[model samples]
Target: ADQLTDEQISEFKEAFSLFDKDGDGCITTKELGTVMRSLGQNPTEAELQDMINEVDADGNGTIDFPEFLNLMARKMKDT
Candidate 1:
């Protein structure tokens, strides 16, 4: 993702907003699950918990902006 243009970064930021409701500087597990699609659709609490494992680098229950960007970048690379 090093070569990702400013437009791509901005697009990811916009996508992140969907998970960062309340503008609290973080994303909850449910939101992450919605973004990640762990179980087809409409993730359960268990699925949401799994979502935390995917990007919660700080070990917190929530994911901050940097971790959000990091996860997005990693996924883009994996693709």
Candidate 2:
């Protein structure tokens, strides 16, 4: 399995920190919505729900560090 390089991991960690509001080591839908809002794109409820469903591992309704990493890894590959 491919793994992110150290540099990619570092960058991803930084981004994760920024997005993981509440400092709970997870990225919640609310947190992600704030991020999108900051970028001038307030995602609709449906969109947010879809993202959470797609990325949240363990079906916990939240995105923890591992789930976030998986998301970034897949995105990097696709791009």
Candidate 3:
């Protein structure tokens, strides 16, 4: 909420929208699979777990806005 830069928030907002179907303002692991497949991936359960593990901080089974932003930030830095 109060953490992200305006620019960062703008980009994450769009990416988040693609997966936050039902307009729930949140994303689940299940929804992520759908988005991935849409983007041309077909991950098995193990791959899905690994994907979630990349961004699911707090060990929750879901990815909320902040966690999503954190994931974006991490990737931006790692690259």
Candidate 4:
């Protein structure tokens, strides 16, 4: 597993909460659009659904912190 520094983790936490919408600790499709655009990725609903499916390990139709962190960790490394 890739380890994120505390600074990065905290920064991610802030961004997560910013779009979490209802403070449910999970980011749903509705909230996901905002996050995607924030990252400059303006994906259509179809693409968004595909992305969610890939990141949603539990099949709960939403992304929790661990799942979010997993996706972002790889992205951080690649960038």
Per-model CA lDDT versus the true structure: 0.73, 0.81, 0.77, 0.82
What value of lDDT does candidate 2 attain over all alpha carbons?
Answer: 0.81
Candidate number with the higher lDDT (2 or 3): 2
lDDT of each residue in 1-79, candidate 4, tens digit only: 3567888889888878877899899898778887678778889998888888888778887888888887787677754
Off by over 4 Å in 3: 1-4
Using lDDT, rank the candidates from best to worst.
4, 2, 3, 1
TM-score of each: 0.68, 0.83, 0.74, 0.82
What digit string (tens of lDDT, one per residue) describes model 3 on residues 5-66?
87778878888986788768778767988877877988887877777777776777678887
Reference-based lDDT, residue 36, model 3: 76
Pick by TM-score: 2 or 4, better one: 2
Off by over 4 Å in 1: 33-40
What residue pairs are clashing in model 3?
A: none
Tell me the RMSD of model 2 versus the true structure: 1.8
Candidate 1 — worst ten consecutive residues by lDDT sum?
Answer: 30-39
Q: Give the TM-score of candidate 1.
A: 0.68
Can you give the lDDT of residue 30 in candidate 3? Answer: 77
Query: Distance from true position, residue 50, model 1, in Å?
Result: 2.3
Best by TM-score: 2
